Copies of this chain bind each other. A is one copy, B any other.
Amino acid sequence: MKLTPKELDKLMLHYAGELARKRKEKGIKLNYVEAVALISAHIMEEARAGKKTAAELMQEGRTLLKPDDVMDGVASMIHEVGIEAMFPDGTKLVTVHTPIEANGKLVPGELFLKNEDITINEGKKAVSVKVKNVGDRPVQIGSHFHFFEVNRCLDFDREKTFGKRLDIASGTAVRFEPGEEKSVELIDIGGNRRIFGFNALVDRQADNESKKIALHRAKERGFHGTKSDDNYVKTIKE
């Protein structure tokens, strides 16, 4: 047979699903493990039969278990069942999203939230800058990127954005479609304001003296919207 470790794991999973199906036949309401295993084993068998596509199986995994077939609390615990199955065209990942609908009141890990909003970046004044993507490719910018050093294809008044980042939720992003034009809010970067990396445009302390060096470097490297005055005077370290 030359079974691999994967084949042994999948055989164990198939028989866990078989036990789940037997218990469902006996009239027992399935718990979390049984529901997960039943969905996974059904998907594997369907993929072995070779008569359905992976997308069909993603849709079919959601009709196996009605809400009355599982215990209270089960539906809210199974966000997604992923299972890798071998189709005639090879191994594909099938994920079923929210296979079971909630019918009871039991929610394990239920979150009870205050209805008050969170104020982020408190004490930081936000300026508004209009930005246009003159390139032919999409550009996405995160919350803590130094906005002065974004893709050179974005065009905006770079001088007003030095030492600033997007005033959005941490870990979120703003997208710029090709040709898209929109305005964004920028707050000052906090901490020691020591900007290293990102395009190597600053790589030092952020201040008015280093803003001139950054503007000159940006203009030399073709960053759009950069207007650094001609007759630039170099310093001893650039």
Question: Least Cβ distance of A108 to chain B in Å?
Answer: 13
Task: Take A1-B33, A3-B33, A33-B1 as given contacts and tell me if A16 and B11 are in contact as well, using a CB distance cutoff of 8 Å.
Answer: yes
Report B-chain residues with C-beta under 8 Å of the C-beta of A3: 16, 33
Q: Is A193 an interface residue (CB 8 A)?
A: no
Q: Give the distance in Å from the alpha carbon of A28 to the alpha carbon of B49 in the complex.
A: 6
Partner of A11, one of B1, B8, B12, B45: B12
Interface 1/0s, chain A 22-42, versus B by CB < 8 A?
010010100011001100000
Number of interface residues of A (CB under 8 A): 21
Residues of A55-76 whose CB lies within 8 A of B: none
User: How far does the Cβ of A125 sit from chain B's closest Cβ, in whole Å?
Assistant: 48
Say yes or no: is A15 at the interface (Cβ < 8 Å to chain B).
yes
User: Which of A's residues lie within 8 Å of B, judged by CB?
Assistant: 1-3, 7-8, 11-12, 14-16, 19, 23, 26, 28, 32-33, 36-37, 45, 48-49
Q: Which residues of B contact A14 (CB under 8 A)?
A: 19
Q: A3-B33, A48-B28 are in contact. Are A15 and B23 (CB under 8 A)?
A: no
Chain B: CB-nearest residue to A13: B1
Q: A1-B37, A37-B1 are in contact. Are A19 and B11 (CB under 8 A)?
A: yes
Also in contact, A49 and B26, with CB within 8 A (given A11-B16, A19-B14): yes
With CB as the reference atom, state the residue of chain B lying closest to A8: B12
Q: How far is the CA of A86 from the CA of B11 in the complex (A)?
A: 24
Determine the chain B residues whose CB is within 8 A of the CB of A26 once the complex forms: 45, 49
Chain B positions within 8 Å of A48 at CB level: 23, 28
A45: which B residues are within 8 A, CB to CB? Answer: 23, 26
